[PDB]
Amino acid sequence: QHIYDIVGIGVGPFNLGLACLTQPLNELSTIFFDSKDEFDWHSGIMPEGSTLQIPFIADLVSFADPKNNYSFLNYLKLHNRLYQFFIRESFFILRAEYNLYCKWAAEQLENVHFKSFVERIDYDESRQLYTVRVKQPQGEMKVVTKNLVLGTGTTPITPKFCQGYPEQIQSSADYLRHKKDYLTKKSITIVGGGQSGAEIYYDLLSEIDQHGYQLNWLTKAPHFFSMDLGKLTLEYTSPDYTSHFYSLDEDKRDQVIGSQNALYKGIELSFVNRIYDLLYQKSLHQPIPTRMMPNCALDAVEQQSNHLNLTFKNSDINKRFKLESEVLILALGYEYKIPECLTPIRTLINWDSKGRIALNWNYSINDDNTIFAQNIGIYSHGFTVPDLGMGCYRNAIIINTILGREVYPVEKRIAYQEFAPTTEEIVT
Amino acid sequence: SQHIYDIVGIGVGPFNLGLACLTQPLNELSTIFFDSKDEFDWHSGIMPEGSTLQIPFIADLVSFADPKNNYSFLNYLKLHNRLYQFFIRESFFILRAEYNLYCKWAAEQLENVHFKSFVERIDYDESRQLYTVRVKQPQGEMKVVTKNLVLGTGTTPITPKFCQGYPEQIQSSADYLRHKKDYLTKKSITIVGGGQSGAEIYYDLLSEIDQHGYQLNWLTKAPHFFSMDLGKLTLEYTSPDYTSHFYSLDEDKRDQVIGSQNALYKGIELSFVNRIYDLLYQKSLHQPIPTRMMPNCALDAVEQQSNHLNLTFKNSDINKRFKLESEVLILALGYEYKIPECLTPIRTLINWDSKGRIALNWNYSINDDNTIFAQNIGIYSHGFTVPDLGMGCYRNAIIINTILGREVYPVEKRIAYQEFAPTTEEIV
Amino acid sequence: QHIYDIVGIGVGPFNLGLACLTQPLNELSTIFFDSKDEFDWHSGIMPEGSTLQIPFIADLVSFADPKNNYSFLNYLKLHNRLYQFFIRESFFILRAEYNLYCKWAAEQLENVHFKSFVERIDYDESRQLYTVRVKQPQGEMKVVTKNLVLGTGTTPITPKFCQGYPEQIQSSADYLRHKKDYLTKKSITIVGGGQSGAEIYYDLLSEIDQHGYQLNWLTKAPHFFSMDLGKLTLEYTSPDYTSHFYSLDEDKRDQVIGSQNALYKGIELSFVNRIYDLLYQKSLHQPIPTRMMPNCALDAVEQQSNHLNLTFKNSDINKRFKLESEVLILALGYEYKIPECLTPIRTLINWDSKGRIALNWNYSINDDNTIFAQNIGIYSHGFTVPDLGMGCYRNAIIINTILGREVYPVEKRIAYQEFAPTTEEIVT
Amino acid sequence: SQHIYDIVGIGVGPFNLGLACLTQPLNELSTIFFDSKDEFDWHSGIMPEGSTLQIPFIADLVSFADPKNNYSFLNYLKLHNRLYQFFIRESFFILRAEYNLYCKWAAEQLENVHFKSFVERIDYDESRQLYTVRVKQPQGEMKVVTKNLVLGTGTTPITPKFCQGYPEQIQSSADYLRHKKDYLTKKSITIVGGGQSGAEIYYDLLSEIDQHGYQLNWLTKAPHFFSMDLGKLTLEYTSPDYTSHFYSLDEDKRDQVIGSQNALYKGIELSFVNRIYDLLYQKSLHQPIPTRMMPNCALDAVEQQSNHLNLTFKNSDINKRFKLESEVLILALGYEYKIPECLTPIRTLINWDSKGRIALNWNYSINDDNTIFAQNIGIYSHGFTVPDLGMGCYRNAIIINTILGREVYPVEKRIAYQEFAPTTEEIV
Ligand SMILES: Cc1cc2nc3c(=O)[nH]c(=O)nc-3n(C[C@H](O)[C@H](O)[C@H](O)COP(=O)(O)OP(=O)(O)OC[C@H]3O[C@@H](n4cnc5c(N)ncnc54)[C@H](O)[C@@H]3O)c2cc1C
Ligand SMILES: Cc1cc2nc3c(=O)[nH]c(=O)nc-3n(C[C@H](O)[C@H](O)[C@H](O)COP(=O)(O)OP(=O)(O)OC[C@H]3O[C@@H](n4cnc5c(N)ncnc54)[C@H](O)[C@@H]3O)c2cc1C
Ligand SMILES: Cc1cc2nc3c(=O)[nH]c(=O)nc-3n(C[C@H](O)[C@H](O)[C@H](O)COP(=O)(O)OP(=O)(O)OC[C@H]3O[C@@H](n4cnc5c(N)ncnc54)[C@H](O)[C@@H]3O)c2cc1C
Ligand SMILES: Cc1cc2nc3c(=O)[nH]c(=O)nc-3n(C[C@H](O)[C@H](O)[C@H](O)COP(=O)(O)OP(=O)(O)OC[C@H]3O[C@@H](n4cnc5c(N)ncnc54)[C@H](O)[C@@H]3O)c2cc1C
Ligand SMILES: NC(=O)c1ccc[n+]([C@@H]2O[C@H](COP(=O)([O-])OP(=O)(O)OC[C@H]3O[C@@H](n4cnc5c(N)ncnc54)[C@H](OP(=O)(O)O)[C@@H]3O)[C@@H](O)[C@H]2O)c1
Ligand SMILES: NC(=O)c1ccc[n+]([C@@H]2O[C@H](COP(=O)([O-])OP(=O)(O)OC[C@H]3O[C@@H](n4cnc5c(N)ncnc54)[C@H](OP(=O)(O)O)[C@@H]3O)[C@@H](O)[C@H]2O)c1
């Protein structure tokens, strides 16, 4: 019977930020649902000492309002860790601490409900009402709302040729769940040279002398490339660039986004460099039983005895080769999967030439501007669509759109670079 | 006229400015703050381009007490369109010039913070238990009445008596920038004092030594141009833990301890030490640099000559005196607390220690009433972080809590992994 | 009448290194010629403080033989800079010191002749000897030799449409000759986003407050990207990778080189970050009169009243635009131009399908293996062909080839990575 | 047997090893070296994986004297296929395990460097002007005669008197790796000493604390866990300039000066201090770490209890003593010079100062004939760099020049920008 203004579907950092930023707005009735038991930010792939790769300003609220109660600094103040964090004097939060922080913020918000799987959404055009059915442990529930905000995140990619070997092939995302088993194996092969694979490789490399596994690491990319966090390149993480990229033609958007892996993927440079320093240190007396191979794409898997035969394609020599491995860790990246709850309103969503969800500038995905998208469409808003540092930018625009006024005024120019000439400098 | 303030702040440096920022939210308290300068100014005469604070930006006016407060540096950054850029810059250290803009911004918002206001005299009325504070402003003298004083008159450059009276030739490092243009035309410049002040002037003048004709001399009495020890295990001394520990030691041990801690808060920022050497290396490539640097050298006498000063130095290593000629002498000998003249009529109401110094209670009051509180007084009583901008919020919280008689701003008790004393039970 | 074993054409760092490495080998008779007045390593684009981008081990000899008299370390020892260089504790030599280093070495070798322009080479098919004709101020030298080593380096790129404007368009290579005029202009435009452009941008941005120029910097690259010097990418600077790249198909070689701009071009990361910090600092009080545009390619210059009209294509928006500018600095990179002296023996040199000089693995470019190439064939030996870190490698192979002996034995594997599988794992 | 040596080196740590490397190309000198250990070993018992030297690699056996020398670390790297790898690693600090292999490799080249050779006794024959050196070897007792002696017997762990006689429970930091496996099974470990040895054991044990059940206690009597000051202006004290300055001072001043300089060559390396804090921060995220760190605490009593030690410390801040229980105690109290027993028969030929210490001449000889030289003796005589590996070549050059009577390895007189004394003409 109560009509919500917003239902958030999924509570990752982005919708959690939205809860924190709408909490102070008494005008808005909001509710949020997440299927997990409690907040968890990728803790299956979270070795001790792992950090976010961007500064702590990219918390749930501070880019929109440093005064908000759920800033990371206030969390630190309230948990007797503020002085300690600044003695540590790193801009990068420990991923475990970031988990504790978001858990704390999620726990303060009564309208944020975990153990809540959104299974179905329907729309009543006469009342402009979405009905959201949620499976909760005590049973199914119904809420109605004017606006939806989708924040269902992304999930590991598993190629179809890699399915059906649950005992031997696992995703990087579940690494800590299996590391104990991994340490007893004769051979471990990581596929994918991004940050996930790099952290797993460093973690296994650190312990390689205490066990008897061979440690292989392969990526199809032309090298184990570093993420380019050069500051002039960081200006692309900006309202400036977001707005510029969204204005671009659709094919141009795909080309540009295709060239930008080094802006937000790859390996953190200092981490790259720690891997090398560890290789140097452990090869002092005898060679390390480890192999690293760029330009190699896994394209086949077959069982044989009690190991896998992994077939790769070396793009440089254009040949295929086989390595044997007892376990295969896929660190192949994450992808957006459409939530099944959207199925009955699919005809309410706009789609582009290529059948992807089409976004408006303000992150709505329908003509009525009542369905908004968290972390959807790097092809539409650019490579910072998954960047925690642009989460406040997006939530502020969502909030401003829904309430129809500048609740959180958003910056328009923070970059010294210009990504286009003024309309008056163009030559006919 | 008949209005009675809870607090009068005398002086508005960062410490009393922070106190005004942290009390403004408290509508119980009626507070007012007076400063003699034309406007807020934080040592802008010794503020070369690119110069920074030596502690992280968390050490702003309010954030260690309350990260939600409206006058945090991050909120300043947000309201001035510098928040995204500050974090692309990704330094913990605020440009000294930006810290000046930030404080002037805070001061301008607080209508009870009055500059052009010299506090000439303080009297006490034992019948009413009220201080009357006489203030000289451009339009004349005014009187205000208050229950509590908070003394925030800061520190001033040390100019020994033998260096006074040579205005054209001897200047304080505090006024470097007003005299830099004249300096560049001289044939010899001698900087005395090897702290951060002297170092920045040395680097600045060395940086342009090739475009002029000055010999550049730099001498310190310290046993070497030592660096400030900001080792994180030493930073735990910047903490409630250590302030409380130090305060509890006896007076003579406190003088011993503080006399041993020059490296914890004075000396030169390490990376700045290193930039100086690198510049020496770079500029000595083709020919010697006309510069001299001499440790273990104390300025001993100053004799006027024809067109220069004869500077006598005592070298303590060889226990001999020597003379240098210099056209101008830049005094970078450090800063000292001078008891303001307004306090004279109430001196017999203030507590003094066994060495004739103002004595402070744990809560920073200097009388039995606990109605007069001291900002940046008593390095010998609360330790070397008494002038530390990072402990300003801790002191302000305790003052505010004392005056209101409750924990408005609750204060940390242990933040250090180290213990500075065993437990009662472990003592033999 | 005397028959040399080696004539070196051009004495840049690579042939200078070959002189230093063949000098201890009395079985070789060698001579080198260079047209400049003395050794000069790009001193026209060498702002004070600028450094090499690779560690000092990439000197003239040390990768082949650290004992050699012409190591950088020995240079520093003999010049009372060894202790100082290691207090400075940077791996990167100042460019001005590297110049002094190479000048020092070139001056010790009497068989290294400057003011010597190699004008013509002919080949005696019967005696298997080359006749080299050298123009010198006092006349012409004719020497006979069994082998040639070409080390004529590379030169700045000037597009045809930028030619014919000697007053208003200059190369970045001549920056320091023109800086004084530049500082007087109303507008300065730098085209090219590599290290050359960046250092000029930084150098002019540093002084922008003292003059009245607008400072524009544009590149056609998708961003002002950083050079990827991650240690796992540095492993591509190796015999391992050089041999691997050399073996690849011709078109694969061009594809790979096309994708590797970040391995050896773009901007030094520490240097990109200093640029941003300077922009941050200098915009504190007012906006900087500077513009930076990626994705912009200069494609026309037109003369006007007292300035140039510069038309650019912005590839993101697929439109062209015009800026006005009094001076235009070309920082578009360097290119190999084949020396005129080779014209008579062109028929001796091997060419590939694109009409480029075709190199054998041992860096010879003819079937006799008597003409060797320094810094030719990025399309054949890969992106490290101009890498000072690989000069001793190539020189050892050139020396070993000419003598038919392992005089300087060369490493076959220094990398943890493998760029190809073992022969036995290949799948048919 | 009757062969008359020019030099007998007693002890072969790095300093006499470098002397062997520097004298080996001088055929005028007949030298022999004896060391009592089974082979060269540089503190391998306190050599955790990844531990490094704290000064740059230029401070190898020979390179400050002669970068061309065959025994340079760079030459070592090249011949062991680690030169390229070392410079990709791009750290100035050699892993202590690698430096160990380097010194082992150098010692293996020198047929005149004999291990398993304890110099038992030294006599002097006035009639022959020869020292007889009696050496205990596995085979028997070897005698050799020699004109000069160079004492290089190093330093040994400090063990207070009240800490002797508890072999199963108290061990030196020097033997940490012999006992680490036992340590990990204990309930309580206590490290006394806050220097680099203490820090490395502390960090090593802290890293593994979660997988075990020890409480980990660390205490130093220093007023904080101070960092070693390696500011480059302080690095200039590691120089011939300062050694000559320090040597020239009077004896009491030398003791005073050396007393003030702990931060210059002791303490903890700054980056290591900061890693310890970062690890403490990381491992306290969920539960408090079972560890204690106490400065200002001097161990002054050990007391056997049943299953553990009662450790009594004096907290000098509060001037009280307290007891901690500990199953094991690790002494990281530093190292001392002990006079070798073999010098006893020639004690009356050695010069002694007014305090009973070995008195050194400027050229490092300790007798009037200038035929007995001292490695790593006389910190009170030649200053804090007497044990500094970066000054080994300087001392060795001066020893070799003295014995040969000419400037064989010329020695720098001034490397420092600073002056530690005025010119004679300036003195009053
Ligand atoms: C290991 C890792 C580290 C990363 N580190 C960084 C970083 O340092 N900086 C940065 O800018 N980016 C980083 N990213 C990228 C990005 O920030 C993360 O992917 C982030 O978790 C995405 O945020 P979110 O709110 O979109 O989705 P998520 O954090 O994925 O959360 C979405 C949640 O919605 C829930 N959900 C899905 N469907 C339903 C449903 N039908 N009903 C109810 N709930 C549902 C799921 O439980 C899911 O957990 C990282 C990504 C990974 C994988
Ligand atoms: C150049 C410099 C840089 C420093 N940098 C740092 C740093 O990076 N980190 C750190 O922790 N510490 C730093 N310090 C130390 C310390 O923080 C400063 O000295 C700081 O300014 C002290 O603040 P304050 O409120 O005590 O006094 P101040 O900032 O000195 O302010 C005192 C004010 O009181 C006014 N006043 C005095 N008497 C009267 C009166 N009778 N009536 C009215 N007004 C009066 C004066 O006009 C003055 O403006 C620095 C000090 C200096 C000099
Ligand atoms: C500004 C700049 C900085 C660079 N920095 C680095 C770096 O830090 N690290 C790195 O690995 N690479 C660097 N490079 C790339 C490369 O190392 C340089 O281009 C290097 O100068 C090339 O060396 P060289 O021996 O090929 O040719 P050069 O240094 O170009 O020298 C060739 C010489 O041959 C002479 N010559 C030409 N023709 C004749 C003739 N017919 N007769 C006689 N003499 C002739 C010329 O006078 C010329 O000086 C840099 C390049 C530039 C332009
Ligand atoms: C753990 C540790 C790390 C250090 N790291 C550094 C550093 O990074 N940088 C730096 O500048 N300094 C460092 N030092 C200080 C100094 O360099 C070392 O103490 C160094 O080992 C001293 O060198 P040495 O040649 O004097 O003596 P040692 O290395 O002690 O060698 C002494 C040798 O003499 C032998 N010997 C003794 N008596 C006899 C005898 N009667 N007959 C035969 N042989 C005998 C011993 O067996 C021993 O091998 C370190 C010290 C320690 C303890
Ligand atoms: N030791 C040092 O610090 C130092 C100093 C200077 C140079 N170097 C080295 O010397 C080499 C050359 O450096 P460089 O900066 O002179 O050349 P560069 O690295 O090739 O940079 C030139 C840039 O200008 C772009 N460009 C070319 N034509 C253009 C056009 N019409 N319009 C707009 N942009 C255009 C290029 O685009 P593309 O990316 O598409 O080619 C490229 O990005 C580099 O490897 C460099 O590292 C080193
Ligand atoms: N390359 C490396 O990484 C490395 C590793 C180990 C050692 N070293 C070098 O070797 C030298 C010795 O280092 P070290 O750490 O073994 O010893 P150290 O530097 O001399 O420090 C030992 C510490 O224990 C303190 N101490 C002495 N007696 C004590 C007592 N009864 N109770 C409590 N504390 C006591 C000492 O206090 P005081 O300060 O009052 O004397 C000192 O701080 C140093 O120069 C070091 O730099 C280098």
Side-chain angles (χ1 to χ4, degrees), chain B residues 31-107 109-119 121-125 127-135 137-140 142 144-160 162-167 169-180 182-186 188-258:
Chain B
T31 74
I32 200 173
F33 300 80
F34 297 109
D35 190 279
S36 50
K37 306 208 289 332
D38 287 352
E39 66 208 290
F40 184 92
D41 184 84
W42 192 61
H43 307 297
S44 76
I46 172 64
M47 192 173 63
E49 256 205 287
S51 65
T52 58
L53 284 89
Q54 274 155 328
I55 62 184
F57 70 88
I58 188 59
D60 65 11
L61 297 169
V62 295
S63 292
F64 267 125
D66 184 5
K68 304 184 287 170
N69 185 276
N70 180 77
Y71 306 98
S72 72
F73 181 67
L74 294 191
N75 193 48
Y76 166 82
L77 285 177
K78 172 73 176 180
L79 272 25
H80 292 259
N81 200 67
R82 305 271 285 180
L83 182 50
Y84 281 84
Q85 304 90 320
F86 179 91
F87 277 93
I88 297 178
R89 177 169 170 262
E90 210 175 298
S91 166
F92 276 103
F93 305 101
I94 309 178
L95 295 163
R96 285 227 287 284
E98 193 163 46
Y99 185 79
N100 248 289
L101 294 183
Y102 156 64
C103 290
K104 295 166 84 145
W105 169 76
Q109 308 305 112
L110 305 175
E111 296 250 346
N112 62 337
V113 171
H114 304 283
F115 289 86
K116 306 205 175 177
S117 304
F118 173 68
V119 175
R121 180 188 181 92
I122 294 172
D123 293 77
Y124 183 62
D125 173 15
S127 89
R128 294 245 165 256
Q129 308 181 68
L130 292 175
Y131 305 89
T132 300
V133 172
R134 210 140 291 172
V135 185
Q137 298 181 309
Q139 327 78 215
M142 81 155 319
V144 311
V145 186
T146 183
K147 284 171 172 143
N148 303 263
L149 312 167
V150 183
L151 307 171
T153 50
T155 59
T156 49
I158 296 166
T159 58
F162 80 107
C163 294
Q164 311 184 353
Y166 304 89
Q169 314 170 267
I170 304 186
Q171 293 90 25
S172 173
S173 56
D175 305 309
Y176 168 64
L177 289 175
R178 304 177 188 84
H179 298 282
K180 174 185 187 174
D182 300 318
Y183 290 156
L184 299 179
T185 87
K186 302 298 179 175
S188 45
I189 307 167
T190 302
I191 308 167
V192 179
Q196 189 67 24
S197 276
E200 291 189 14
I201 291 169
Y202 183 78
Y203 187 77
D204 202 56
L205 290 171
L206 175 59
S207 293
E208 318 172 16
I209 195 163
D210 296 324
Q211 279 74 56
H212 303 89
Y214 49 82
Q215 162 95 25
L216 178 57
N217 299 327
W218 187 23
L219 306 86
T220 184
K221 89 198 263 266
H224 58 121
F225 289 95
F226 62 98
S227 340
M228 195 167 37
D229 185 348
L230 299 185
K232 288 176 192 175
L233 287 181
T234 305
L235 288 178
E236 291 205 314
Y237 282 52
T238 308
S239 69
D241 313 47
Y242 188 73
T243 300
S244 274
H245 167 82
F246 182 96
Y247 181 84
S248 78
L249 306 178
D250 70 61
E251 186 183 314
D252 275 0
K253 172 61 67 165
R254 283 185 267 111
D255 284 319
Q256 168 186 107
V257 166
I258 235 299

Side-chain angles (χ1 to χ4, degrees), chain C residues 217-267:
Chain C
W217 188 21
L218 302 87
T219 187
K220 85 203 230 268
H223 53 124
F224 294 86
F225 61 106
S226 320
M227 195 172 31
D228 193 343
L229 295 190
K231 282 170 203 181
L232 290 177
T233 295
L234 283 187
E235 285 212 311
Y236 284 51
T237 297
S238 74
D240 307 52
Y241 188 69
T242 299
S243 267
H244 163 76
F245 185 99
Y246 181 84
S247 65
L248 301 183
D249 174 288
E250 175 162 344
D251 296 330
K252 178 62 62 176
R253 277 188 268 116
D254 285 335
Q255 169 200 319
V256 168
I257 263 297
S259 71
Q260 289 180 325
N261 282 342
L263 276 69
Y264 70 118
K265 300 200 278 174
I267 312 165

Side-chain angles (χ1 to χ4, degrees), chain D residues 374-392:
Chain D
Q375 312 266 36
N376 199 7
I377 312 179
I379 238 175
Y380 50 80
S381 159
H382 277 80
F384 70 97
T385 64
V386 156
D388 190 306
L389 292 177
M391 292 296 282

Side-chain angles (χ1 to χ4, degrees), chain A residues 217 221-233 235-236 241 244 247-249 252 255-256 259-260 262-263 267 269 272-277 279-281 283 288 290-296 311 314-321 323 413-414 416-422 425-428, chain C residues 217 221-233 235-236 241 244 247-249 252 255-256 259-260 262-263 267 269 272-277 279-281 283 288 290-296 311 314-321 323 413-414 416-422 425-428:
Chain A
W217 188 21
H223 55 122
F224 292 85
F225 57 96
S226 309
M227 191 171 45
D228 186 350
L229 299 195
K231 283 175 193 180
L232 298 178
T233 294
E235 290 213 317
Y236 285 53
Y241 190 78
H244 160 81
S247 80
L248 295 197
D249 157 282
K252 173 57 63 173
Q255 158 191 25
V256 167
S259 65
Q260 278 172 333
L263 276 65
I267 311 159
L269 177 65
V272 161
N273 288 3
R274 268 152 70 203
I275 291 178
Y276 188 86
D277 292 359
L279 288 170
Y280 184 100
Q281 159 192 322
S283 58
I288 302 169
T290 188
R291 302 179 77 178
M292 292 184 45
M293 281 175 157
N295 300 294
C296 291
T311 299
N314 183 294
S315 51
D316 277 13
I317 62 170
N318 202 66
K319 294 168 195 181
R320 291 169 91 242
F321 67 98
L323 309 173
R413 171 111 189 256
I414 67 97
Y416 298 96
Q417 285 167 93
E418 296 160 70
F419 304 114
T422 64
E425 294 169 308
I426 304 268
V427 190
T428 60
Chain C
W217 188 21
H223 53 124
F224 294 86
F225 61 106
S226 320
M227 195 172 31
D228 193 343
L229 295 190
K231 282 170 203 181
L232 290 177
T233 295
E235 285 212 311
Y236 284 51
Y241 188 69
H244 163 76
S247 65
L248 301 183
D249 174 288
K252 178 62 62 176
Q255 169 200 319
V256 168
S259 71
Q260 289 180 325
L263 276 69
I267 312 165
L269 176 64
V272 177
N273 295 346
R274 284 143 68 174
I275 287 167
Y276 189 88
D277 292 359
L279 293 158
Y280 187 91
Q281 170 194 305
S283 61
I288 307 161
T290 191
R291 306 179 75 183
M292 279 172 59
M293 302 180 155
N295 302 295
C296 291
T311 313
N314 179 302
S315 62
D316 266 5
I317 60 174
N318 228 287
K319 311 190 177 187
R320 296 163 77 246
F321 68 96
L323 313 172
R413 196 196 167 157
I414 64 120
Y416 295 97
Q417 273 158 106
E418 286 165 84
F419 308 103
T422 86
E425 1 208 30
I426 283 153
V427 168
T428 68

